[PDB]
Amino acid sequence: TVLATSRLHIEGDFRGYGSLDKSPPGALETLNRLMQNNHDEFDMFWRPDAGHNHTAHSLLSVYALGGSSADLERAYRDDDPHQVPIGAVDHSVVASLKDPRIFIHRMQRLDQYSNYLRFFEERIEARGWKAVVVEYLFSRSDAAEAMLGQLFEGAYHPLIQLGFGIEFELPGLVAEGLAHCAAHDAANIIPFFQKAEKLAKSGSVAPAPLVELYKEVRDTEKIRLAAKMTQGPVRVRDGVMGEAQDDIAAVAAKFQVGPDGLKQAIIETTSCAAYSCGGAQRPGKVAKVDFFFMHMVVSSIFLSILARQDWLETEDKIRLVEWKGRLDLVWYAASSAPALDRKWLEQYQPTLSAGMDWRALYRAVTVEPDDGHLAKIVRSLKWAEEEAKGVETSETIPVAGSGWFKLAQMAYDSTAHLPIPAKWIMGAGYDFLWTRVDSL
Amino acid sequence: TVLATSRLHIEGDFRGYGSLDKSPPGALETLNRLMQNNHDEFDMFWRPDAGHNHTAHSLLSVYALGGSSADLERAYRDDDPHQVPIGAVDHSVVASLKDPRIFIHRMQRLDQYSNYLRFFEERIEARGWKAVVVEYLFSRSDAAEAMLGQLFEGAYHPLIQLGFGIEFELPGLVAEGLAHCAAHDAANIIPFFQKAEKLAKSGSVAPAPLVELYKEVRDTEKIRLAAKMTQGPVRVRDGVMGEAQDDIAAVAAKFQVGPDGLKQAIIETTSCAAYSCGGAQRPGKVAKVDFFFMHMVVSSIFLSILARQDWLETEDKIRLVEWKGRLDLVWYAASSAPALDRKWLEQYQPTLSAGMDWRALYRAVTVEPDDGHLAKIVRSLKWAEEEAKGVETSETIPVAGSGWFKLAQMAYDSTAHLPIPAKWIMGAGYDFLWTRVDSL
Ligand SMILES: [Fe+3]
Ligand SMILES: [Fe+3]
């Protein structure tokens, strides 16, 4: 039986957070065709590590930046490597997932994506997508607490997938996000979240600004050196969580958001993530942006979007921002906690993007061969500028004002005209990775 | 203390199995300097999966094919991505490794490579490389039995590393190989070897020709479909061993070598591996060689070399070839057990390599940008021609005579002038991987 949920159709003139120029005629038709092909044909996971399908992200971000049909076609073709046949659905597995104990038991296995997708499309057909999201992420059941930890997995890819689904109110894409969240392999971050939150709610831990928690991670040798360069995509699971889970959980417990603090906590987390990207440069080297710090920035727009959902309690919004800010510390550790300095972004001189404004940089991004991360980071940075409107740099807000566009320029300048593997440095704290980077 | 073992000096006439032209003057001095630099500066593992450092393989193979200094420098620069800083040695761990229970206990952890290297260099300094290899692979201690399974790990890279060391009688390279063997992460192949051998020695399993065991793997649906395309580097651990270990153990138990069978078993295993490579083609597609089948052929020369060692008993030689032939069945399964047909290699018309002899193919391979697999597969095929001199195709020997060189031509034609990722098909049985291969 075909479900109306399985049909992804964007209609009306909503073109995304941080949108500037409207896409020219033809773009929406192209977007709907490609989003549906990707939905129907392709799995969420194309390899065991760092194998998230970015197709939907690249399409929606290029549309939000005002890309034409041909720019969307480029985005789709550039993500050919992310596109592999979707796994066969086992319909008796899908029936059995109604049982919360079987639902939980089958989580954290990549090969279950297509079974969770059918399950969530059926549930969303029966209830709204809103009711299903509350049931499976925010209802405090054993299932939903596991799902909430899973949401941040793999440097925030489930969060990003559900984010887009919620942003465009696309039921089928919300199903993609929930199924991604359920199936994502575990980095042993759930006990990090549980231990950090317990300490945070105990009354034994005084809050501290996030900027100081980045510093504690760097200054704490056991934590800074927990990850190893050659652990690659499993640095969090085998390093930070393997060796220092309790230690970094105690640091993370110090990130505590007051009941009126949701907006400021989004700016604080986003500003620190942006500081990460801009601030981890080396003397005598061209600017490069850390691949992981870039995921910390791209995911920030989805905290802003979830924050404006009327069906979601303020306390759940705050909880999302707390957990994201705490895992930002883990990703900072996994890059070997590089020294950050406000000087690099302040002093940065744009090259390829010299003299561009947002509209010209958006345009330049729509035509740039890329897997979608460029469009995603520049859109997050435009949105951050609006979120943090009238907030200036302070001891606790390291990036603000003209900083947001400067980082977008740096991300464009340091990735344009390069093959994918050369675009982003894979852990700015590891000295050896800077020997493969150009000297000024 | 500096060990004499730590210094790699290749001196004098010996230039490798299947060698033809002598390298011109200057090459030996370049080879010694680069082999030493790689030995002292770089780890064995540069990422957690498919992360083996091929630098020593690419150098020694290019030398054996008669490459000059410039060709060896090319080989070294092409393997730049394989070259990351060698791990800090813990000297108290090194002293503890003399205890066989601590030895066993720290096995199968990649980050121990440098610790096992220093241990094996100290032991080889004291006793000689030959005594240390017998002790740690062939003495049937607990440690040696675990090391013998590890030898075949990651599609034969420890076997290859040790093989080169034994071939050039290079103490320090023997130590690299034994340390690689100890540290390699486990794919759950040890229980496969144990189960297959217990069945073979039981008296209850009749021997069958290897080519009929490839057929049985293909024709047993539970074995053929155990591996999944998107399991990628972990198809063996999570697919063939995860789902079908007992099943494929029972097939592999039928490969049994009699006490006078060593030479014919090397020829049989090498011929079935070559047949894998040349025979897994598709109608209407350009020829491509499977990456894993290529590893099955390149490893085959090191069985021939181990077979000629005076210090190793015939029993042990026979046991190596048995285990290798049995695990070739597992790698065949992991590529989805593609249909094989002798017609493809029989009918193949060389393109780039048309009209070349071995000397000209060797010369062309010395200059081809590559990570070392091209030089390794063409040398194993030349050596296979020598090993199998006077053996013709039969019901059990599916490739012989002119087929060895014809496969070397196909490997050259199908990989030359392509970037590394386009060179070898990563599982010839998976229909989807052929949609990215050029049509005729
Ligand atoms: Fe990503
Ligand atoms: Fe290899």
3-state SS, one letter per residue, for chain B? CCCHHHCCCCCCCCCCCCCCCCCCCCHHHHHHHHHHHHHHHECCECCCCCCECCHHHHHHHHHHCCCCHHHHHHHHHHCHHHCCECCCCCHHHHHHCCCHHHHHHCCCCHHHHHHHHHHHHHHHHHHCHHHHHHHHHHCCCHHHHHHHHHCCHHHHHHHHHHHHHHHCCCHHHHHHHHHHHHHCCCCCCHHHHHHHHHHHHCCCCCCCCHHHHHHHHHHCHHHHCCCCHHHHHHHHHHHHHHHHHHHHHHHHCCCCCCCCCHHHHHHHHHHHHHHHHHHCCCCCECCCCEHHHHHHHHCHHHHHHHHCCCCCCHHHHHHHHHHHHHHHHHHHHHCCCCCCCCHHHHHCCCCCCCCCCHHHHHHHHHCCCCCCHHHHHHHHHHHHHHHCCCCCCCCCCCCCCCHHHHHHHHHHHHHCCCCHHHCCECCCCCHHHHHHCCEC
Closest CA to A376 of A299, A287, A428: A299
The number of C-beta contacts closer than 8 angstroms across A and B is: 42
**In this structure, are A153 and A172 located in the same domain?**
yes
Measured CA angle at A77 (ends A74, A81), to 5 deg:
145
**In this structure, are A77 and A98 located in the same domain?**
no
**Facing B48 at nearest CB: one of A85, A231, A432:** A231
**What is the C-alpha separation between A350 and A412, in angstroms, rounded?**
9
**In this structure, are B67 and B102 located in the same domain?**
no
Exposed/middle/buried for B63, CB within 10 Å: 0-12, 13-18, 19+? buried
Domain boundary among A155, A183, A211: A183
What residues of chain A lie within 8 A of the CB of B238, using their CB?
48
**In this structure, are A231 and A330 located in the same domain?**
yes
**Facing B85 at nearest CB: one of A45, A85, A432:** A432
Closest CA to A19 of A297, A375, A339: A375
Exposed/middle/buried for B283, CB within 10 Å: 0-12, 13-18, 19+? exposed
**In this structure, are B157 and B210 located in the same domain?**
no
**Facing B47 at nearest CB: one of A48, A84, A232:** A232
The CA distances from residue B279 to B267, B273, B398, B399, in Å, are: 17, 10, 10, 10
Q: Do B47 and A234 touch (CB under 8 A)?
A: no
Buried b (16+ CB within 10 A) or exposed e, A237-267: bbbbbbbbbebbbbbbbbbbbeeeebebbbb
Q: Do B47 and A84 touch (CB under 8 A)?
A: no
**In this structure, are A163 and A272 located in the same domain?**
no
What residues of chain B lie within 8 A of the CB of A233, using their CB?
48
What residues of chain A lie within 8 A of the CB of B43, using their CB?
230
Domain boundary among A159, A183, A207: A183
Contacts of B69 (CB under 8 A, 6+ apart): B26, B27, B29, B30
DSSP 8-state code for residue A5:
G
Please give, rounded to a whole number of angstroms, the shortest distance from the CA of A2 to a CA of chain B. 26
**In this structure, are A198 and A323 located in the same domain?**
yes
**In this structure, are A164 and A307 located in the same domain?**
no
Contact B330, B240 (CB under 8 A): yes
Which conformational region is residue A141 in: left (phi greater than 0), alpha (psi within -120 to 50 degrees), or beta?
beta
**Radius of gyration of the CA atoms of chain B, in A:** 20
3-state SS, one letter per residue, for A98-154? CCHHHHHHCCCCHHHHHHHHHHHHHHHHHCCHHHHHHHHHHCCCHHHHHHHHHCCHH
**Quick one: CA torsion of A369, A372, A378, A384, rounded to 10 degrees?**
180
**What is the C-alpha separation between A429 and A386, in angstroms, rounded?**
30
B160 CA to middle of ligand 2, Å?
9
**Facing A45 at nearest CB: one of B51, B111, B230:** B230
Contact A254, A201 (CB under 8 A): no
What residues of chain B lie within 8 A of the CB of A234, using their CB?
48
The residue behind tokens 């050196």 is A225
Helical axes A262-279 vs A314-334, angle rounded to 10°? 20
**Facing B230 at nearest CB: one of A43, A228, A233:** A43
DSSP 8-state code for residue A368:
S
Exposed/middle/buried for B4, CB within 10 Å: 0-12, 13-18, 19+? exposed
DSSP SS3 for A203:
coil
What residues of chain A lie within 8 A of the CB of B45, using their CB?
230
Q: Is A143 part of any domain?
A: yes
What residues of chain A lie within 8 A of the CB of B234, using their CB?
48
**What is the C-alpha separation between B326 and A116, in angstroms, rounded?**
37
Q: What share of chain A is helix, strand, coil (3-state, %, to 5)?
A: 60, 0, 35
Contact A427, A229 (CB under 8 A): yes
A58 CA to middle of ligand 1, Å?
10
Number of the ligand closest to the Cα of A299: 1
The residue behind tokens 């890309």 is A67
Contact A233, B48 (CB under 8 A): yes
Contacts of B158 (CB under 8 A, 6+ apart): B150, B151, B152, B177, B180, B181, B184
B325 CA to middle of ligand 1, Å?
41
**In this structure, are A57 and A166 located in the same domain?**
no
Q: What is the longest distance spanned by two Cα atoms in chain B?
A: 61
Q: Where are the beta strands (DSSP E) in A56-110?
A: none
**What is the C-alpha separation between A379 and A20, in angstroms, rounded?**
10
Please give, rounded to a whole number of angstroms, the shortest distance from the CA of B51 to a CA of chain A. 9
Chain interruptions in chain B, by residue before each (C–N > 2.5 Å): none
CA A78 and chain centroid, separation = 20
**In this structure, are A200 and A318 located in the same domain?**
yes
Q: Do B229 and A432 touch (CB under 8 A)?
A: no
Q: Do A48 and B49 touch (CB under 8 A)?
A: yes
* Residue B154, domain extent: 91-183
The CA distances from residue B203 to A415, B190, B212, in Å, are: 63, 21, 20
**In this structure, are A78 and A95 located in the same domain?**
no
Q: Is B261 part of any domain?
A: yes
Measured CA angle at B274 (ends B273, B278), to 5 deg:
120
Contact B114, B43 (CB under 8 A): yes
**What is the C-alpha separation between B149 and B191, in angstroms, rounded?**
9
The pair of structure tokens assigned to B336 is 């989805």
Closest CA to A335 of A418, A198, A218, A437: A218
B237 CA to middle of ligand 1, Å?
26
Please give, rounded to a whole number of angstroms, the shortest distance from the CA of A149 to a CA of chain B. 24
The CA distances from residue A262 to A268, A292, A304, in Å, are: 10, 24, 10
**What is the C-alpha separation between B15 and B62, in angstroms, rounded?**
10
B416 CA to middle of ligand 2, Å?
17
**What is the C-alpha separation between B220 and B217, in angstroms, rounded?**
5
DSSP 8-state code for residue A372:
S
What residues of chain B lie within 8 A of the CB of A46, using their CB?
230
B238: nearest CA partner in chain A: A48
The pair of structure tokens assigned to B170 is 């290079």
Domain boundary among B163, B183, B203: B183
Q: How many residues does this entry show for chain B?
A: 440
**What is the C-alpha separation between A89 and A74, in angstroms, rounded?**
30
Tally of domains in chain B: 3
Closest CA to A296 of A386, A381, A412, A181: A381
**What is the C-alpha separation between B229 and B240, in angstroms, rounded?**
12
**In this structure, are B194 and B179 located in the same domain?**
no
What residues of chain A lie within 8 A of the CB of B230, using their CB?
43, 45-48, 51, 84, 110
Exposed/middle/buried for A234, CB within 10 Å: 0-12, 13-18, 19+? buried
Q: Do B234 and A84 touch (CB under 8 A)?
A: no
Handedness of CA B273, B274, B279, B280 (dihedral sign): positive
Q: Is A440 part of any domain?
A: no
Measured CA angle at B115 (ends B110, B121), to 5 deg:
125
According to the entry, how was the structure determined? X-ray
Please give, rounded to a whole number of angstroms, the shortest distance from the CA of B76 to a CA of chain A. 15
Q: Is B301 part of any domain?
A: yes
The residue behind tokens 């899908």 is A94
DSSP 8-state code for residue A323:
H
**What is the C-alpha separation between A226 and A214, in angstroms, rounded?**
15
What residues of chain A lie within 8 A of the CB of B229, using their CB?
84
Exposed/middle/buried for A197, CB within 10 Å: 0-12, 13-18, 19+? middle
The pair of structure tokens assigned to A415 is 């990735």
The pair of structure tokens assigned to B158 is 């420890």
Number of the ligand closest to the Cα of B56: 2
Closest CA to A419 of B369, B420, B371: B420
Contact B335, B430 (CB under 8 A): yes
The pair of structure tokens assigned to A399 is 């990036």
B37 CA to middle of ligand 1, Å?
36
A52 CA to middle of ligand 1, Å?
7
The CA distances from residue A230 to A29, B28, B81, B84, B394, in Å, are: 44, 32, 12, 8, 47
A433: nearest CA partner in chain B: B84
Q: Is B299 part of any domain?
A: yes
Which conformational region is residue A26 in: left (phi greater than 0), alpha (psi within -120 to 50 degrees), or beta?
left
In order, the DSSP letters of A266-321 are HHHHHHHHHHHHHH---TTB----BHHHHHHHHTHHHHHHHTT-TTS-HHHHHHHH
Query: In what helix (H) or strand (E) does residue A61 lie, and over which residues does it extend?
Result: helix A55-64
Measured CA angle at A367 (ends A363, A372), to 5 deg:
100
A420 CA to middle of ligand 1, Å?
12
Number of the ligand closest to the Cα of A153: 1
B365 CA to middle of ligand 1, Å?
38
Contact B151, B158 (CB under 8 A): yes
**What is the C-alpha separation between A17 and B22, in angstroms, rounded?**
67
Q: Is A3 part of any domain?
A: no
Q: Is B418 part of any domain?
A: yes
What number of other Cβ atoms are within 10 A of residue A185's Cβ?
A: 17
Q: Is A267 part of any domain?
A: yes
What residues of chain B lie within 8 A of the CB of A51, using their CB?
230, 232
Contact A86, A69 (CB under 8 A): no
Contact A67, A23 (CB under 8 A): yes
Measured CA angle at A84 (ends A111, A229), to 5 deg:
75
